[PDB]
Design a protein around this ligand. Sequence first.
Ligand SMILES: *C(=O)CCCCCCCCCCCCC
Ligand SMILES: *C(=O)CCCCCCCCCCCCC
Ligand SMILES: *C(=O)CCCCCCCCCCCCC
Ligand SMILES: *C(=O)CCCCCCCCCCCCC
Ligand SMILES: *C(=O)CCCCCCCCCCCCC
Lengths: 115, 115, 115, 115, 115
Amino acid sequence: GARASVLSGGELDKWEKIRLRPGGKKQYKLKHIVWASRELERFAVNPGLLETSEGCRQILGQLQPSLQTGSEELRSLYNTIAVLYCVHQRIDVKDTKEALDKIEEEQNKSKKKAQ
Amino acid sequence: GARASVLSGGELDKWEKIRLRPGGKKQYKLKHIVWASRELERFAVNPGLLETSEGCRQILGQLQPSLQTGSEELRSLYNTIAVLYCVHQRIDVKDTKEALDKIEEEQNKSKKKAQ
Amino acid sequence: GARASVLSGGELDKWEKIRLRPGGKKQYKLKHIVWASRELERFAVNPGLLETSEGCRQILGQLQPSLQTGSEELRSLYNTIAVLYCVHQRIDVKDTKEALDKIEEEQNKSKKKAQ
Amino acid sequence: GARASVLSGGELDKWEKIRLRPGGKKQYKLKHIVWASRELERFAVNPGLLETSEGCRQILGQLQPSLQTGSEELRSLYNTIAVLYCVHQRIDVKDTKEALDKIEEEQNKSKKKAQ
Amino acid sequence: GARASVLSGGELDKWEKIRLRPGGKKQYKLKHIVWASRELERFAVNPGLLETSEGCRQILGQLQPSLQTGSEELRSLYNTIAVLYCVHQRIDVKDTKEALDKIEEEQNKSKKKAQ
Ligand SMILES: *C(=O)CCCCCCCCCCCCC
Ligand SMILES: *C(=O)CCCCCCCCCCCCC
Ligand SMILES: *C(=O)CCCCCCCCCCCCC
Ligand SMILES: *C(=O)CCCCCCCCCCCCC
Ligand SMILES: *C(=O)CCCCCCCCCCCCC
């Protein structure tokens, strides 16, 4: 399926069109996820969770209470996974802030039915 | 993005362990994926249908009325997609028949709510 | 004192007779314990815990909410600690799987005393 | 404003007047803060929290669940942060034992409002 | 730890985002703080008040009867202290006119309750 993910219409075509900060001029590149797998190996977490929507959801849930306490490098790792989740859900975003709004709307829906 | 599919216990590891017919001493090789891409390219099919399991189901759905008419090569393409579906859904498939039983389970379930 | 550790029928004498994996020829070695003890620095955990059954059990309790997202290294350490707990409590387990069942059986009994 | 904490009665002055232990002639030095910061950066914790008591109260919460199994270095780091909290809120602490008497006492007092 | 103040996202990263006057392009610079320390030293007042939000809030109450008759330097100094109060509360103030509104805004609220 990785062979399809690299075609011009797939998930990794979508990945490199996304902006850093709504005003910004930088974009995501493929090695951002490679770096995210390196951090998951450092923190002893299965890297295969990046390949799934369910794996990405739980990792975002693990990261969540420690974001402010953590440095902006941790937040960069979280943002990388939040953008990837948005790609896995087949939705386009223009920037990271927009991807974070997508996680927040899903959390608003999820929160209602989590009792 | 993709990280476990290439590793042991992953999708390619299942591909090279799954038997062509249940007692057979030959397993699927990676060339069948390339051949399946070529048949799908000949049909002019969307590549995202090999990224997701629902897409594999669209391919399976069109193939399904054609199987009885089809050659063993046409049926090989169906079995190839059926294994990729089961593999993408992380089923510990040992052979082609087990992959088919799971595809049959999905049809039987779909029929159960088709009223 | 220290001299009693290597006494025959003792915990060290038993460790080497135990299978790493049920079907295999691979036995547990003291090098596994040495590697595990080093990696407590990585978790920021006291090595003195490995002396005592209660300390080993606390290591299992710390590992517990990470197990299902953890990488194969985390599972390998958990499994190793479970065999160490069984050896410390003088329970004859022939391989890793028996230890995993017995650690669970204590927790399952504890569960009806815990609220 | 940080430059006005260099003055007698300020933060730098209170820090270096506190004994490391309840016994022995060794006192805390500003270089201990550098080691504690370097460990917090290694754990990927935000330095921006170190000038704020609310930030320090969070850092004390971050270290708290792992104290039980914690290394002597992790416990020493916790003690170092605890003295900084006392220094920030200008408590006249003579040693680590007074800082930790005051913290248990403040926790008992805090618990009687928040529960 | 005191490095937090000059960290990006710290107080003195914020100090330089502020324009001196609504129509001026020059920013607030760190020497305004050094100057304020010297002005306090010249008129025999302890500079420790600078390190804290409350000491700045108190200076604004104290120098309030001095504003009506004081010199341009006195008004500049009062405005500098209002900006420090705003910076201690980590506010991205556009300019002096805003810093002054922020002080009045908290004062109407405080004056009702601090009787
Ligand atoms: C999905 O299509 C399974 C195919 C085999 C896994 C491919 C792993 C990535 C190899 C490098 C990219 C090749 C692109 C044609
Ligand atoms: C997720 O799908 C992101 C895709 C980018 C993966 C790039 C991996 C590069 C690995 C290079 C070293 C090993 C092969 C020579
Ligand atoms: C430790 O302090 C000794 C405790 C009492 C003896 C335990 C058994 C020791 C067996 C190995 C050494 C035998 C020496 C004659
Ligand atoms: C308030 O007085 C705090 C600092 C105000 C302006 C920042 C300039 C740098 C101060 C720290 C210097 C440290 C030198 C080792
Ligand atoms: C936090 O920044 C604590 C600062 C303590 C300064 C004095 C001791 C260390 C001096 C050299 C390293 C300075 C790093 C900011």
